[PDB]
Design a protein around this ligand. Sequence first.
Ligand code: NAP
Ligand code: NAP
Ligand code: CDP
Ligand code: CDP
Ligand code: CL
Ligand code: CL
Lengths: 320, 330
Amino acid sequence: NEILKKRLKLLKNNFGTHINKIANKKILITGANGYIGSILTLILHGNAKLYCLVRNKDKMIDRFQEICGDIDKIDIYEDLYKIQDKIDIVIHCAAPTQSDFFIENPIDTVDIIYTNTKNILDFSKKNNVEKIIFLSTMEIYGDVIGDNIVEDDIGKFSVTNIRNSYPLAKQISEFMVHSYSKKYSLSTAIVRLTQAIGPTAQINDNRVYMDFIRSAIKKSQITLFTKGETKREYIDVFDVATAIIFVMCEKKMFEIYNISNPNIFISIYDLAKTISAKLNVQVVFDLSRRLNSKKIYQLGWTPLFDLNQSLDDMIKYIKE
Amino acid sequence: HMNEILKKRLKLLKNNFGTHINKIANKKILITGANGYIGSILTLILHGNAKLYCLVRNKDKMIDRFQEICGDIDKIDIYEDLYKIQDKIDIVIHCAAPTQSDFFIENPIDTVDIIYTNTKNILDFSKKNNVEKIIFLSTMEIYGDVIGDNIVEDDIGKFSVTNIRNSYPLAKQISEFMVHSYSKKYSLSTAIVRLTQAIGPTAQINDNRVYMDFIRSAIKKSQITLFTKGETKREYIDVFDVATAIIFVMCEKKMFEIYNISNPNIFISIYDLAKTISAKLNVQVVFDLQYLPSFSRRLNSKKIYQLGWTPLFDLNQSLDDMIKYIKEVN
Ligand SMILES: NC(=O)c1ccc[n+]([C@@H]2O[C@H](COP(=O)([O-])OP(=O)(O)OC[C@H]3O[C@@H](n4cnc5c(N)ncnc54)[C@H](OP(=O)(O)O)[C@@H]3O)[C@@H](O)[C@H]2O)c1
Ligand SMILES: NC(=O)c1ccc[n+]([C@@H]2O[C@H](COP(=O)([O-])OP(=O)(O)OC[C@H]3O[C@@H](n4cnc5c(N)ncnc54)[C@H](OP(=O)(O)O)[C@@H]3O)[C@@H](O)[C@H]2O)c1
Ligand SMILES: Nc1ccn([C@@H]2O[C@H](COP(=O)(O)OP(=O)(O)O)[C@@H](O)[C@H]2O)c(=O)n1
Ligand SMILES: Nc1ccn([C@@H]2O[C@H](COP(=O)(O)OP(=O)(O)O)[C@@H](O)[C@H]2O)c(=O)n1
Ligand SMILES: [Cl-]
Ligand SMILES: [Cl-]
């Protein structure tokens, strides 16, 4: 409770004037039971009227109660076509996010993401939504290398590499989003996220940082199967949520934003080291690319959570 | 008239390639978008030899098209409903797509949705009815930013999500991905053929692709107008040569393969195409300045050559036959 409360209070202090340009907007969040979707719901519910599209209502209640949210101030739907009230802003978070799924089920990866993007843009256009935010991925930059990748950079994709299911589905989605904006004057923004971290992540999450946390707790040891020199950007999930909120507030027909914390670029080894020290174990061995996130800074956004707080909060949160 | 042209063409095909055409007699062949330029020519060449199934949006349109091109309607079965086809189909050739530039940019969303959904549907139909092989007609627009000559099937292009004109290539790219993925997960044999631009007889006067823009302007306006400087160079290929290349690929037994299909002997600037057409119709070419970015590109077509295919028709024959066919109709 206290971890989340301290975070809700810090956000409001730094940016409450912004969260305010959002008072009583009707906000639809798809994939709202998900990591990012649920943190957005938490932050915005009450101060606005929150509609949550999810595959399973009960799963939504359980997640929302766990992270200390008032279910009586969210309207949970399972069927887009039952939402009858007017909607001001849509945040589309719904997607399959398991890497395994991308290679095991590349057909459905494409079909699911394509179909949902289509359905939500159709819904948005028909409903004369004020703005739709589409959550995308740094995987859209594909091959591109550099320490300063801008939104106008563009990956290439082999059609015969099945792991491209997810980036190719997000690319076609992005194209549809821009298209609805140019054709119909529907306000849209795309946000390309690095990789979210911080409290409310679960022990079973298939991400390297959580593999390290799990392995330190269960095996009292973290094993690296390479030298771990690859560097990766991370950003606290609350700082993702606040960035999306800033984008929501910008009146602009079309825009693309990289969302990352440019202070966090860490090697896998260094990540393993700090996690191990935090859990009183050791790293043992058994034998890149950075986005420019300057654009988002121009809205007045800043990230509040550094890697160390994000890890402490995430670990402490799991333990309790 | 028309029929002399067509008969001569079919006889040449038989003389050169009757061997390969024969590897397919009595196969059950489903052609989607069969009323279109390439689909209908494939049907023309193949009906009689083999059992032809033609999926179209409108049966009478397909009847009328097939008779315009001197086909025998009693030797093909036309369907408007995929689900109403019962017989075990051996080979599917997927030809249905929107092809007009204007539609790509006025309707980018519908461009993507139509191509994606039709690809998905025909792949599910194929998988479900244990089809031997499916051939997917793709485009040299797949190569995106790739420039210059000798472009091989493994070369990969980049695409901007903010260029509305990418509706067609992004839709083909995601479809290619789908097609590869079905061959990798279900052991369905798939082929992708990346085509340049077909020309030749039985092109219709309302087509808005550039060759017909020129011909139709020549005839109606007594003048051809370019809207660009026309320095873009492209590859062209006679529609009957496209169809024979597709037939050679049909005969391959290969789990997955991508082929460039072009005539390496035909590479021409838009301008020079305009002037040569204007020579044939006794008009002038003019400009009104004030489309794709103005690249230049040639495909490596060695794989299809390797199967034993050659193109039979030169640019003058293709254009002459195309123009004469159009004069005879209207
Ligand atoms: N986490 C990141 O750093 C990150 C990075 C780049 C992009 N993104 C994108 O941002 C969005 C949110 O990510 P996240 O981290 O919150 O992901 P998450 O925790 O995996 O949750 C994703 C949400 O989508 C739903 N979903 C999953 N499969 C679905 C399907 N087949 N049909 C419909 N809904 C489905 C999930 O509902 P169920 O529980 O019912 O499956 C859940 O509500 C996604 O679009 C994701 O691709 C996230
Ligand atoms: N011609 C070329 O140089 C060339 C080059 C590259 C790629 N290709 C590909 O080759 C294939 C055949 O091209 P083509 O030149 O024969 O094209 P076409 O003459 O324009 O014929 C298109 C075919 O697709 C059908 N079609 C169009 N819109 C449709 C829709 N919304 N739903 C269902 N069917 C639809 C048309 O039927 P309707 O009468 O019902 O509209 C017709 O049967 C296409 O996939 C095309 O992208 C052609
Ligand atoms: N136990 C581990 C896990 C990851 N790694 C390194 O960390 C990188 C990122 O790990 P990951 O599991 O998130 O993703 P992949 O990029 O390996 O699919 C790996 O490519 C390895 O170089 C390691 O060295 N030892
Ligand atoms: N009337 C015309 C038609 C085409 N064009 C040029 O010819 C090219 C090919 O025409 P198109 O409409 O088939 O081609 P895309 O640009 O859609 O590939 C265009 O890109 C323009 O450069 C022209 O200058 N004037
Ligand atoms: Cl519902
Ligand atoms: Cl559209």
